[PDB]
């Protein structure tokens, strides 16, 4: 009924790592949580919407003293929240005003690959504009935008390129959920950073091939935030946007909250928690009820023993409303019995990370699957011992979770998901269908692992057609371009991920 324990295997948690960086409460003064504005469309009708999404360098006051140099989408850090709607024709102008190339990846959006998907093979160069057009046919959910060059995605997310994407549909608009964005429905983008001299970031100084975590939590680009509650119920859209950290979320007083949404859909039924764990790139939407609190009270959201976000309780209109027993009808696609069970094995830690025995190669296709055909994917984490949880992510689909070592999925995994935490020794079985042809990455979403090789890619295809040609990114193109952009020789260019490739004697 009420889940008081984190689901993942406790001995594998990040906090047992030899080089774990605990979070430390910053000295900085507490302040209102930043809620990113809603990106104003250029233009909108019932059928169409037009946006311009602009990657940009700038500065952001994060700590007392100097501004921290940051990157962002239509703002200096993170990004304004982008809203998309099932069935609506969407036109996005991607505009790079940074000094380096970037990529615009719509994490969890079921769009064509490899260009609209905006992964490794979709560079936008400084000064360039690219136009994309798509229509999403997927249920309401919380997705996100982040940068995806291969490598280094980790550098560009650390700089600050991430933004929440909200997907609306008609069914979700019929439900009795908080939805007044910025008042009772808010992003809780969870991140960490380490601040250095003059409050700057230095990804390189902090590089660790097993995952970069700093001591200072940063929620929606804010240090020591607090939220003014003016409603009995608040909807929190949790996003783990850290490069590696696991968030182990729970309130003072064990105040319960009820998860209503996962990565790719509403959950079929609400699930009540007191303690909720999220690995990288996972989303969880929860409803918190503040009815048992007096005006003037204060409630604190923690991760482990560390306070993250304070809820200040003001006067609120009482709210009767209960959630229905059924939020969402999961229609599971159908597996053709003549397909194999695909088996995908994540191996290694630190610099040794790999999938199915190999590190990612941007030019090499690792797998194929025909479109419109669901297949069972067995996904294994080989790590022994106590080891670690790797969050596995697949571009271009939302899957369903069928089993964890032959037993039931976790209670909040009965809806659609694009990212899944896999414990050491574990095999999760997934039901994976790709509606669109293209090239799509699959990988660990600990971002240093991804950059450091724990990545592969699948070509999805129409079996009624000849093989397609895709211009794939090559490493020489990337390093000439970054060399020109930084004003250096290709041989002095540094990128997060290189060290993992170099040390195992492997060619990026």
Nearest residue to Cl ion, scored by beta-carbon proximity: 494
Is 235 a binder of Cu ion (CB under 5 A)?
no
The single residue among 235, 395, 414, 433 that binds Cu ion, judged by CB under 5 A, is 395
Q: How far is the CB of 439 from Cu ion (least distance, A)?
A: 13
Alpha helices in 243-402 (DSSP H): none
Q: How far is the CB of 280 from Cu ion (least distance, A)?
A: 9
Residue 458 near residue 403 (C-beta atoms within 8 A): no
Binding segment (CB under 5 A) for Cu ion, from list 184-192, 377-385, 395-403, 425-433 = 395-403
Name the binder of 64 from Cl ion, Cu ion, none, CB < 5-8 A by kind: Cl ion
Name the binder of 449 from Cl ion, Cu ion, none, CB < 5-8 A by kind: Cu ion
Q: How many CA atoms lie within 13 A of 505 on its CB side?
A: 0
Strand partners, 455: 443
Q: What is the Cα–Cα distance from 401 to 423, expressed in whole angstroms? A: 14
Is 121 a binder of Cu ion (CB under 5 A)?
no
Name the binder of 21 from Cu ion, Cl ion, none, CB < 5-8 A by kind: none
The two structure tokens encoding residue 454: 């724990």
Phi-psi region for residue 304, left (φ > 0), alpha (ψ -120 to 50) or beta? left
Residue 253 near residue 290 (C-beta atoms within 8 A): no
Name the binder of 458 from Cu ion, Cl ion, none, CB < 5-8 A by kind: none
Q: How far is the CB of 63 from Cl ion (least distance, A)?
A: 6
Name the binder of 255 from Cl ion, Cu ion, none, CB < 5-8 A by kind: none
Name the binder of 395 from Cu ion, Cl ion, none, CB < 5-8 A by kind: Cu ion
Is 390 a binder of Cu ion (CB under 5 A)?
yes
Nearer to Cl ion among residue 203 and residue 392 (C-beta): 203
Q: What is the Cα–Cα distance from 352 to 500, expressed in whole angstroms? A: 7
Residue 302 near residue 308 (C-beta atoms within 8 A): yes
- How far lies 136's CA from each of 84, 87, 111, 328, 469, in Å? 8, 6, 7, 18, 25
Q: How far is the CB of 300 from Cl ion (least distance, A)?
A: 21
Strand partners, 430: 377, 401
- Of 282, 267, 274, which Cα lies nearest the Cα of 323? 267
**Helix (H, G, I), strand (E, B), or coil: what is residue 260?**
strand
Q: What is the Cα–Cα distance from 1 to 456, expressed in whole angstroms? A: 39
Q: How far is the CB of 489 from Cu ion (least distance, A)?
A: 32
Q: How far is the CB of 454 from Cu ion (least distance, A)?
A: 5
Interaction pattern, residues 431-470, with Cu ion; x per rule: CB under 5 A: -------------x-x--x---------------------
Q: How far is the CB of 493 from Cl ion (least distance, A)?
A: 5
Q: How far is the CB of 449 from Cu ion (least distance, A)?
A: 4
The two structure tokens encoding residue 338: 């003549």
Nearer to Cu ion among residue 139 and residue 225 (C-beta): 139
Residue 119 near residue 145 (C-beta atoms within 8 A): no
Nearer to Cl ion among residue 161 and residue 288 (C-beta): 161
Which parts of this chain interact with Cl ion (CB under 5 A)? 61, 64, 493-494
Cα 245–chain centre separation: 12
Nearer to Cl ion among residue 470 and residue 494 (C-beta): 494
Q: How many CA atoms lie within 13 A of 191 on its CB side?
A: 24
What b-and-e string marks burial along 112-145, b requiring 16 or more CB atoms within 10 Å of the CB?
A: bbbbbbbbbbbbbeeeeebebebebebbbbbbbb
Interaction pattern, residues 137-166, with Cu ion; x per rule: CB under 5 A: ------------------------------
The single residue among 107, 245, 248, 443 that binds Cu ion, judged by CB under 5 A, is 107
Name the binder of 182 from Cl ion, Cu ion, none, CB < 5-8 A by kind: none
Q: How far is the CB of 154 from Cu ion (least distance, A)?
A: 12
Name the binder of 494 from Cl ion, Cu ion, none, CB < 5-8 A by kind: Cl ion
Contact residues toward Cu ion (CB under 5 A) are: 107, 390, 395, 444, 446, 449
């Amino acid at each position: 009924k009420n889940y008081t324990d984190y689901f993942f295997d406790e001995p594998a948690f990040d906090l047992h790592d030899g080089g774990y960086v605990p979070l430390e409460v910053s000295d900085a003064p507490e302040k209102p949580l930043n809620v990113p504005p809603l990106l104003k469309p250029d233009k909108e009708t019932a059928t169409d919407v037009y946006y311009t999404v602009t990657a940009e360098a700038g500065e952001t006051q994060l700590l007392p003293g100097a501004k921290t140099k940051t990157w962002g989408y239509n703002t200096s850090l993170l990004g304004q929240t982008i809203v998309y709607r099932r069935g609506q024709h969407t036109h996005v102008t991607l505009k790079n005003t940074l000094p380096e190339l970037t990529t615009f990846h719509w994490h969890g959006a079921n769009v064509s690959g490899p260009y609209v998907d905006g992964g490794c093979h979709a560079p936008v160069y400084p000064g360039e504009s690219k136009h994309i057009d798509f229509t999403l046919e997927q249920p309401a959910t919380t997705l996100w935008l982040h940068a995806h060059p291969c490598p280094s995605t980790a550098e560009q997310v650390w700089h600050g390129l991430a933004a929440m994407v909200i997907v609306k549909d008609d069914h979700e608009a019929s439900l009795p959920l908080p939805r007044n964005y910025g008042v009772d429905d808010i992003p809780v983008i969870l991140q960490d950073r380490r601040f250095h001299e003059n409050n700057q970031w230095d990804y390189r100084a902090d590089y660790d091939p097993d995952g970069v975590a700093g001591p200072t939590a940063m929620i929606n680009g804010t240090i020591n935030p607090y939220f003014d509650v003016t409603t009995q119920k608040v909807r929190l859209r949790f996003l783990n946007g850290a490069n590696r950290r696991e968030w182990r979320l729970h309130f003072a007083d064990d105040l319960p909250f009820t998860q209503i949404g996962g990565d790719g859909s509403l959950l079929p039924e609400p699930v009540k928690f007191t303690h909720l764990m999220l690995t990288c790139a996972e989303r969880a939407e929860v409803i918190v009820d503040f009815g048992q609190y007096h005006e003037g009270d204060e409630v604190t959201l923690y991760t482990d023993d560390v306070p993250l976000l304070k809820f200040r309780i003001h006067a609120f209109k009482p709210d009767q409303t209960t959630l229905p027993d059924k939020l969402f009808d999961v229609k599971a696609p159908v597996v053709d019995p003549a397909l194999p069970v695909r088996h995908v094995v994540m191996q290694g830690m630190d610099e040794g990370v790999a999938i199915d025995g190999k590190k990612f190669a941007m030019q090499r296709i690792d797998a194929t699957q025909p479109i419109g055909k669901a297949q069972y994917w067995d996904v294994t984490n080989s790590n022994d011992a106590p080891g670690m949880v790797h969050p596995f992510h697949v571009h271009g689909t939302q899957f369903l979770v069928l089993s964890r070592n032959g037993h039931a999925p976790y209670p909040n995994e009965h809806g659609f998901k694009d990212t899944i935490g896999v414990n050491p020794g574990e095999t999760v079985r997934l039901l994976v269908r790709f509606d669109l042809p293209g090239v799509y990455m699959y990988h660990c979403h600990i971002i240093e692992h991804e950059d450091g090789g724990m990545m592969a890619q699948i070509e999805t295809f129409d079996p009624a057609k000849p093989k397609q040609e895709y211009k794939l990114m090559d490493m020489d193109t990337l390093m000439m371009a970054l060399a020109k952009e930084r004003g250096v020789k290709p041989s002095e260019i540094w990128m997060g991920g290189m060290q993992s490739y170099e040390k195992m004697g492997m060619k990026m």
